[PDB]
Each structure stands twice: as structure tokens, then as C-alpha cells.
Amino acid sequence: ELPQMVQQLNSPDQQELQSALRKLSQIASGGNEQIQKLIEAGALSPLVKLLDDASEEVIQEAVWAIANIASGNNEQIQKLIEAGALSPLVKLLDDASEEVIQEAVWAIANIASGNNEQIQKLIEAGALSPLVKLLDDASEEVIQEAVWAIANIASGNNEQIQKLIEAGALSPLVKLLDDASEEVIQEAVWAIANIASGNNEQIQKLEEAGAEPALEKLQSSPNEEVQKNAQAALEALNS
């Protein structure tokens, strides 16, 4: 029963709370129809409120649940935004533990896979500066999630690409085109290719960041997905 589970999300007993959270998390990972049941049961507002509580154990499980709800359709992401999820998720990128940060980045990356109005709400919540910061100081595992989030934001409109440039994304993205991991290069090259499809001013900023020789190195890559994006970005730089 979902209504009792939702009620248990504001229970003083930490075991009853954690048990209700685990039950909710399992439902949230079961596809869009299961996510819809959570929305209809009014689970999103109490879930989001758990991002501010004292226990890092509770926050970790709540972030996991939110990240899975964010894998839902755009209307489901919209309900998560309406429940006030973005400001507390962005806040976790600054003061929470590395384990909590990784899950918050995954939630943000999933929200960024939504429509341009949803990417706009992420930008307004202040996601760009902490995401760009993660591209160089965080662990290889967190870098992979951060680049994917940025690649999703870069798929937005030219005004959103401009906000990424202003947040200082180009220098670390160019550096990640020569990263050891192919999965990192894949997202880095897609982000660059998206920025390359922007306006002439944005193309000039890519050239100034040294994208051209970095992209020329990748047009000989064994990974076919990397090769296509590199070629596209290079054709955009030479117009």
C-alpha cells in the first residue's frame, strides 16, 4: 500500500522511514508506469523534503529514488521540478559527501535529458557552476556523470549553450577529449559537437579553447560514435 508508505516518509522512527524509502526506491526503479503510481500517491513532495534532513543515510536513499523518478518521461520530470527538487539537488553538489554528490549528479543528468524548459529550470537553480567544477577535481567515476549532465545541457538551445560557455565549460571539455576513458570522450565529443552547432560567436569560443587539434586527433578513433561527432564538430568549425 502506497498511501501508508508516503505517510511513513515523515515518521520520527528512522527504521520505519528508511524501510518506507527502500520500498519507494524499488517502485521508482520499476519503469514509468511504477513512477506514475508514486506521483499519484503524492510521494514526490515528501521525498524532496528528505533532501534537507540531518541523516546522510536518508539523503543518499532519497537522492537514489529521485534519480530514478527523473528517468521517467518529461511530464514525470516536470512533476519532480514542481515538487521543488532542483534547488536541494544543486545544493548537494557543494557540501554533501562524494557518494551523495555522484547520485545528485546522476539525478541532474536525468533531469537535463528533459525538454529545453526543464534544462532552463536546471540553469536557473544554479547547476552549471558546480557541474563544471566537477569536471577537474572529482573522481573519474563522478567526472563521467558530470560530463554526461553537461552534454545533455549542451543539447539545449543557443542561449543555454551560452550559459555553459559563461560557466567556463569549454576549457575542461576540450581537455576531456584526450581523457583515458572512451566513455568520457564519447560525452565530451557530443557536448563539443552540440556547442559547434551553435552560433558563430560560440564556434569562435570553441576554436579559442583549442577544440580543432583536439577534434582532429579523434577523427582516427577506433570508436565509430566518437569519429562521427568529431567529424561533425570539425565541419562546423570550418564553415
Binding site: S113, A154, S155, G156, W190, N194, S197, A232
Partner: peptide
């Protein structure tokens, strides 16, 4: 071209 992926 198309910017988004899914």
C-alpha cells in the same frame, strides 16, 4: 543537426 539523444 539534432542535438538531443535518448
Amino acid at each position: 543537426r539534432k542535438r538531443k539523444r535518448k
